[PDB]
């Protein structure tokens, strides 16, 4: 029950703060164990060790006490003083009669603020009655409610109701002045339902996740079962590969996300403050997983539709296109169905990130933009069938193929602009942006290689030297930029846990050390597969080298975001912040 | 929240007994609807109209307090009684020191009792005063408060500790003297999680659930495709029909239980008290529709293999004779896995109706029984594919026929006779067994009269008039006999509800009315079918009269099956009977 409801119910940036359960099991649990025997030593020294134990065990007790009292003092006062922010600019906006849209967000964050801090409170004192409890069975002495009693039930931790008040004139004011009047209306978004991995998976979806899970492994078994016992008229498929890997790519990369999100939820990764999402409704690992099996299904359809013609009226190159159209109506899809919050908020996000440096670059954003670069094989995809569609199929290096590999990287540079023109900070923001910029050069020297052999010119072994040590030049500056920033490995205060961080969020020290291997093995023979993809340097063993590395770079990219998220928690923990910063916008 | 919650954990036979908060909710928002308009009348109108209905509203309110007080006396008598029946006895028991494993059960369910008590008093004081607060809020006023605390919580219903007293007690006898001071393990057994619809379903199931059906839905699609895009050699494919309809039907019937099963479980029918189920563990809707799905996926590869031949070295009929032998394996598993004690106890149950009279009948024996006259189909194919391994398939009226169609008649009709001996009480012992012996005149003079008539004996259409009189006679009989006592249905109490009982468990009324129609139709027809398949009037259109009509009465089973179990509800809903009268056994 205990010891896993709290984890489960725990604010993952109040962690520490919290009381230590387990601790005071293993202790309890060792100091039974360490019992000894009655008849081997005299009787006093059982008395004398218990109560030895006795002491230390109630010493480190109000220790937590105390703890949790000075924190909550700290977080008490911090509402308090909020509140009163958030009340007198009330006044000044009320007398001056958008701001309002805003207004009544600063007013539901504060809120979940003070929730937050009462689940503190019972929270805690479930923990503090239901340890001791254990402690008075255990050692068969009733002191341990005495000692609660004495102590847990008049600290100040909880006897003071301040938060309920607080609760109450927070809610009266609201309806009276923002929803004016409407108790149900206000409290309908006021209100906070369990947040964290306290939320339970429905049942619905689950069983859509699993409908459409088994659908997928039938529809792939019979793909494969057509690759092999079925048609051999291939004759050059190759083109079908090229158009379906980058929907397959699309397809790879929602299901580790998916992945991604449930390892952040459990481990205790608050990933919704990170990306700014709204605590009270949020996307699970469940809804990732069902999104990624429907498409799924659609792509594996239409394959097999390519493979088996069902209807032989309409052309074999309807379905690549119609699977791509479906994609696109269904996340541009303007009804309010099929996930219109999240799809219209990634739209919103998707809008901002091309169109930078014209928006104020936040977490989300960049993080999207950093996984672009996984995309651009989905980009080259896209413009490689666009151009087939228009110049080839008959319906009965040209400059651009190096440009589009390019897209992605410019989009992160820019935004790194942007951010060290608001931050007028040049480290890590101009840094960073010099690590997508050796990515430009790698390029364009590739092409230009590849342009002069083709034509026999005479530059082109130095222009190959000088790409070689451009392109270890680039693998070296991004490998040791992610180890060292984006993952905060490598911190002179490692101490215990070698060759890494004071503190590991996820509780295996092994799968760090996996990730900078694979991190490191991968970021290398990416920049192969970014040089080549953009070059004709060969026709035969490029495509298929571009088409197997291309997946395994989205594996590195799903591994990346784990402890990249993590690094982000460690920084955004320390402070103690579990509600989003908003402002109230000017008048 | 409550209104649903309160539903979801009231015990179904004390549903009358607990507070009508809905009812209370809908007076609340009728008298609110009702007020008249402070200008359009006089204003001490207004008072004068909220004060009749505050008088109302509390001397309803009182009654409710009045008949929760009353009931629980008669359950704390009960219960106290109970124990010292129980306590009494273990003295007896050590003195005199198989009784002892009995006696641990007992307590269990006693103690079962104690806490579903302890529900009913937790449950409905949150239920008492939520109401309340809901009046004063809506009313504004604050009296709902200061009459709550006056009654509610001076009230004997939840003041007195004596149940709390009772389950030490309990729990501390137990493990001094049942498991030998073993706290922890007396603990395990003995404590109740959640029951009913409180249960969630499991995350893990319902996703297995749904990958079941997945792979079930696109494998019956390729079997649809593969009958009529590909192989066109049938060529008497009917053996094969012959052997799998009766695996078809075993996979229909766990589909349509696991939605019995949901329907109880959420209506309120607690099947786990009527089939003496342990209500700690139980299987719910789910794990039925998972084993479903396996199987039928077991079946529709065996099929598939049928029809496209995977391996060539192997002959094709290995397949439905694999399917059944692990469909046995998985049954008779001796391991502690895939639903251990479900499976044992289905072939504890199997065993005592198929031995019968040798055991005391009960009701899940009965209802087996009654169940296996759907299943009659699939004993006669199992016979005819013995037969034809027998017999036939080359390696490289037998008189048995219709003796078959009678055994689940047969044990059904020794069951009853069992029970007449047992209670000595002709009536309805001794009628239901008349019912079953209908059924082996019908099949024995359709076997003669199909005899006679392939012979060309002169007594044919004698035979055929006496048949079709019996066949009438026993339709007739059967359906009268199911809508009047099975169902409890066309009481002389009916009231408002036409053409049925008092109560009905069920919230729509034509579920009643489509379920007697379907049974009228349906119960005829089968009857024909019974005659049919153990006659030689004709080999076209017989066999695909049997194959339609078999899946047909296995759905008019899983309806019937609906109204009987919540006619026994109902039986057993009057004397508020929520536990299973367990005995000590002798000596």
């Known amino acids: 029950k205990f010891a896993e409801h709290l984890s489960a119910h725990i604010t993952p940036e109040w962690r520490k703060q919290y009381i230590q359960y387990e601790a005071f099991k293993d202790m309890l649990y060792s100091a039974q164990d360490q019992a000894p025997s009655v008849e081997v ?24 006490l105390a703890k949790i009292n000075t924190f909550y003092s700290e977080k008490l006062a911090e509402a308090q003083r909020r509140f009163a922010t958030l009340q007198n600019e009330l006044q000044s906006s009320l007398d001056a009669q958008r701001n ?15 929730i937050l801090l009462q689940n503190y409170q019972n929270l805690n004192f479930t923990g503090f009655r239901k340890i001791l409890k254990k402690h008075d069975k255990i050692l068969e002495t009733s002191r341990g409610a005495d000692w609660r009693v004495a102590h847990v039930e008049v600290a100040p931790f909880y006897t003071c109701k301040k938060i309920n008040q607080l609760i109450s004139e927070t809610e009266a004011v609201v309806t009276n002045e923002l929803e004016d009047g409407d108790r149900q209306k ?36 019979t793909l494969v079962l057509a690759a092999v016992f079925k048609l051999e008229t291939d004759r050059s498929i190759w083109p079908l590969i090229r158009i379906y890997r980058g929907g397959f790519l699309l397809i790879e990369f929602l299901f580790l996300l998916g992945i991604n999100t449930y390892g952040w939820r459990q481990a205790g990764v608050n990933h919704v403050l990170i990306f700014e999402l709204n605590p009270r409704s949020n996307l699970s690992h469940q809804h990732l997983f069902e999104i990624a099996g429907f498409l799924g299904i659609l792509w594996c359809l239409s394959l097999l539709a390519c493979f088996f013609a069902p209807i032989s009226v309409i052309p074999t190159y309807v379905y690549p296109l119609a699977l791509y159209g479906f994609m696109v109506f269904f996340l541009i899809n303007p009804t ?3 996930y219109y919050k999240s799809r219209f908020w990634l739209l919103k996000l998707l809008f901002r990130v091309f169109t930078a440096p014209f928006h104020k670059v936040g977490f989300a954003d960049f993080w999207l933009a950093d996984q672009l670069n996984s995309l651009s094989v989905i980009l080259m995809d896209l413009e490689y069938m666009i151009c087939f569609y228009s110049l080839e199929l008959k319906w009965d290096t040209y400059g651009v193929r190096a440009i589009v590999q390019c897209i992605p ?3 992160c540079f820019i ?25 430009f050069f790698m390029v364009t020297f590739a092409a230009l290689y590849s342009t002069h052999k083709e034509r026999g010119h005479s530059d082109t072994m130095v222009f190959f030297y000088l790409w070689i040590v451009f392109y270890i030049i680039s693998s070296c500056y991004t490998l040791i930029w992610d180890l060292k920033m984006d993952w905060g490995l490598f911190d002179k205060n490692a101490g215990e846990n070698t060759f890494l961080r004071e503190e590991i969020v996820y509780p295996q020290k092994a799968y760090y050390y996996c990730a900078i291997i694979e991190d490191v093995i991968l970021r290398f023979a990416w920049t192969i597969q970014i040089s080549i993809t953009s070059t004709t340097l060969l026709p035969h063993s490029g495509d298929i080298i571009a088409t197997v590395f291309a997946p395994l770079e989205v594996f590195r ?7 990249r998220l993590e690094n982000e928690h460690l920084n955004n923990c320390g402070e103690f912040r579990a509600v989003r910063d908003i402002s109230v916008a000017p008048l």
């Open 41 to 64: 030593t005299d009787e006093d020294t059982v008395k004398r060790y218990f109560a030895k134990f006795e002491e230390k065990f109630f010493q480190t007790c109000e220790k937590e």
């Open 415 to 439: 935004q790194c602009l942007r951010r060290y023109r608001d931050t007028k900070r040049a480290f890590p923001h101009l840094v960073n942006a010099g690590k997508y910029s050796t990515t």
């Open 557 to 563: 990219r799903f591994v990346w975001n784990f402890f």
């Open 100 to 114: 309002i849209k805003d207004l009544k967000l600063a007013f539901s964050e504060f809120y979940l603020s003070l």
């Open 336 to 338: 309010k169905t099929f």
């Open 186 to 221: 206000a409290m309908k978004r006021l209100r906070v339902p369990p947040l964290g991995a306290a939320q339970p998976a429905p049942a619905w979806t689950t069983f859509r996740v699993g409908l459409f899970c088994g659908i997928f492994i039938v529809l792939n078994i």
């Open 409 to 411: 990287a410019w989009l």
